[PDB]
Amino acid sequence: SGPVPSRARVYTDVNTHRPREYWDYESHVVEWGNQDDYQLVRKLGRGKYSEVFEAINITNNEKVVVKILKPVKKKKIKREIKILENLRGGPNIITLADIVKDPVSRTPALVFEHVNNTDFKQLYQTLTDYDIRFYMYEILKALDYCHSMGIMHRDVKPHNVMIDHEHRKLRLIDWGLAEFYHPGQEYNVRVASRYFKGPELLVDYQMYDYSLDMWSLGCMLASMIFRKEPFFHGHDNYDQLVRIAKVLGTEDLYDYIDKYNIELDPRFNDILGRHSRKRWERFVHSENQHLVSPEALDFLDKLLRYDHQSRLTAREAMEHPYFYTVVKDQA
């Protein structure tokens, strides 16, 4: 027998109730502007499927960010465009300004509003325990918005969070792997980055949903408050689960697998072994104890769960006592 089906416990039928053209991105018509409106200034970074430059708009002389798309199925370009168009103006989501094709190369590129990245080396030694609570709240704002809009990000990881520390602005970026939730759909499990892949991805369980984003978010929190990056440091995808099982124990993992009737690769059938679920205090030490609190350890533990039904939702997470202080200051 095959796996047990699963449904998201919030925002389940949000896409069912919308007009079709909301989520049916394969038929979306995109009008491609001219990239020579823009002049590339300097590289900002480079992903596996993008290449980000700061540019100026030689018409209104404005800063702007141009992301050249790498050669991917037309489909997935329309999807990222559709999702960005669907989320424009939402809290802490990046803002799409234009969509262009270079005249000669004919390579597609997305054009976004300008943001400044804070010296990523600054963040290490400046981030107070409160600062983590704040920028984590901002991230849950963006995830709750987009889950309410029927979209999962599927690539939540620090290289996809823009922070402007001077102005305390955060933007969630790279929507190239984002996808619409449709109850009962089976999604590709070759998504996210290793260190942030949720258990459901490593065991190939295809009816995942928004809670995938809450696992990854738990990995960031894990790596922030313990100053251990990445927190589950896997040599490959099979090993990654073993790194997780050494922390979360195997008894819960094998419960997870029996509850969903997952069949397990014969590869796994000897590398996982037996492991107790470790206590979070094992990971505290003199140089991270100022970011670790009983509240943070409760909050973190309520995200890193095998069973995806039982992870917090973005909305429940923003209600955790971890965030009491920052909610107070927002008035």
| Burial class of residue 123, CB neighbours in 10 A (0-12, 13-18, 19+) | middle
Positive or negative torsion for Cα 67, 72, 74, 76: negative
| C-alpha span between 65 and 70 (Å, rounded) | 16
Q: What angle do CA 232, 205, 179 make, to 5 degrees?
A: 90
305 annotated ligand-binding residue: no
- List the interface residues with ligand A1IVQ, window 250-309 (CB under 6 A): none
| C-alpha span between 272 and 249 (Å, rounded) | 10
Give the one residue of 120, 168, 251, 294 binding ligand A1IVQ; rule: CB under 6 A: 120
Provide the minimum distance between the beta carbon of 312 and ligand A1IVQ in the complex, in angstroms, as a whole number. Answer: 16
Site string for ligand A1IVQ, 73-102 (x = CB under 6 A): ---------------------x--------
Residue 224 within binding range of ligand A1IVQ, rule CB under 6 A: yes
Residue with tokens 């933007």: 171
Name the H helices within 91-167: 120-126, 129-148
Contacts from 55-59 at CB under 8 Å and sequence distance 24+?
Answer: 55/111
286 annotated ligand-binding residue: no
Residue 135 within binding range of ligand A1IVQ, rule CB under 6 A: yes
Q: Which stretch binds ligand A1IVQ (CB under 6 A): 111-119, 232-240, 305-313, 318-326?
A: 111-119
Residue 45 within binding range of ligand A1IVQ, rule CB under 6 A: yes
Site residues (vs ligand A1IVQ, CB under 6 A): 44-45, 52, 65, 67, 94, 112, 115, 117, 120, 123, 132, 135-136, 139, 158-159, 161-163, 173, 220, 224
The annotated binding site for ATP is made up of 44-52, 67
